[PDB]
């Protein structure tokens, strides 16, 4: 039903496993408290996803060198591409909140990294676009993504601590995932 | 006077320039407001740097797979290595606050990336240690670094907005720099 969304039906096993994930979670100070707070945040954000997506792609569309990654060769945004990616991003927000971070989760994170990278970019949607998303922007996007998310987390009326715990859990989870997605970009053996 | 600190005397021009930097600053939503707030934060943090360093290396030392990157071949921390890096980290905190982010700043960021990477790791201090810091941990460290910094920013008694503006400026600046440092790790042409 969501075109191109292949969580749990990926073709490849990730080159990282649950032991790697344990060690990476430690590097981002993610614990069981964060698991609980990310799940709570899912409940807060669930009815807000359309507006989150409009704000997020508003930012991407606000800078030509960012919108660039969704463009057709003629430099104009590929509207099919954008709309199809948007649907999978909506799922990713929910998955971050509700999935057990197990090997199927890791296999999908590897797949998402491959889809930003030249390895698989443009294949899922069968579009003609830019071959690769420069890595420098994947890392950079940790910031604006967390900044876009923060105001939404307030709105179900929660204590300041709860809201900071949810935002911080999202900052950890975002950093964790972007780190995983780096794999196909990194010189073999340097990751 | 600070061994190995070669800001402004680097051997190589960075493969990125001030136009790249403009585009990356936009990707992390860094503006002139952030320049002002990062400078303000420098004034707040200046007398606190020793304690920041003790807290930061407390975290690194708290996980064997992280402390690993400062170890001698026998698996024990190289104390010379740690102490020498600590001095340059102290400078980096101040430089983030006070340097114009120009080509000399970029050339040093390239150098810092090279020093985490196998390209130059262990050369500055002439130590025998792990050849490479896996990239996955450079990205991950954005989180704990910002989390370690946050409580220090409170303590000169500033408004909540001011403190959040300073923390957010530091989160942007950290993300920006780690993105730059990724260069030698990334497959040529994918950055
Ligand atoms: C914090 C960083 C980022 C997050 C959280 C994120 C999130 C996502 C998600 C969830 C998807 C869909 C994955 C799937 O197919 O199921 C996706 C795809 C995509 N993203 Fe990102 N992304 C990030 C960085 C970037 C950057 C820097 C760009 C550059 C504008 C970008 C542009 C795209 C594009 C063009 C696709 C489609 C890739 C393809 O052809 O399959 N993303 N992103
Ligand atoms: C947010 C991420 C990070 C920040 C802000 C940071 C900061 C720094 C700074 C400022 C230096 C000294 C640069 C110079 O020589 O002037 C340095 C060196 C070093 N860092 Fe990091 N670092 C980060 C990620 C990491 C990670 C993930 C590790 C793994 C423990 C690590 C371990 C080291 C080591 C071993 C050196 C010495 C490298 C060499 O041999 O020259 N750093 N770091
Ligand atoms: C990516 N959105
Ligand atoms: C790196 N400390």
Author numbering:
A (entry chain C), B (entry chain C): 5 to 195
Paper text:
Protoglobin (Pgb) is a recently discovered haem-protein with distinct structural and functional features that make it unique within the globin superfamily. The MaPgb* structure can be considered as an expanded version of the 3/3 helical sandwich typical of “classical” globins (i.e. Mb), with an additional N-terminal extension, built by a 20-residue loop, followed by the Z-helix, which precedes the globin-fold conserved A-helix. Residues belonging to the Z-helix contribute to formation of the Pgb homodimer, which is centered on the intermolecular four-helix bundle built by the G- and H-helices of the two subunits. Thus, in Pgb the access of diatomic ligands, such as O2, CO, and NO, to the haem is granted by two orthogonal apolar tunnels that reach the haem distal region from entry sites at the B/G and B/E helix interfaces.
The sites of MaPgb*(III) mutations (Trp(60)B9Ala, Tyr(61)B10Ala, Phe(93)E11Leu, Leu(142)G4Ala, and Ile(149)G11Phe) are located in the surroundings of the haem, or along the two tunnels; the mutations were designed to evaluate the (structural) impact of the selected residues on the stabilization of the haem-Fe(III)-bound ligand and on the reshaping of the haem distal cavity/tunnel system. The other two mutations considered, Leu(142)G4Ala, localized at the proximal site just on top of His(120)F8, and Ile(149)G11Phe, adjacent to Trp(60)B9 in tunnel 1, do not produce any significant deviation in the overall conformation of the distal site and in the cyanide binding mode relative to the MaPgb*(III)-cyanide structure. off for cyanide dissociation from cyanide-bound MaPgb*(III) and Leu(142)G4Ala and from the Ile(149)G11Phe ferric mutants, all characterized by ligand stabilization through two H-bonds (to Trp(60)B9 and Tyr(61)B10), are lower than those reported for ligand dissociation from the Tyr(61)B10Ala and Trp(60)B9Ala MaPgb*(III)-cyanide species, characterized by ligand stabilization through one H-bond. Overall, the single mutations do not affect significantly the tertiary structure of the mutated proteins, which are always closely similar in their backbone to that of MaPgb*(III)-cyanide, displaying rms deviation values which range between 0.17 Å and 0.49 Å, calculated for 190 Cα atom pairs.
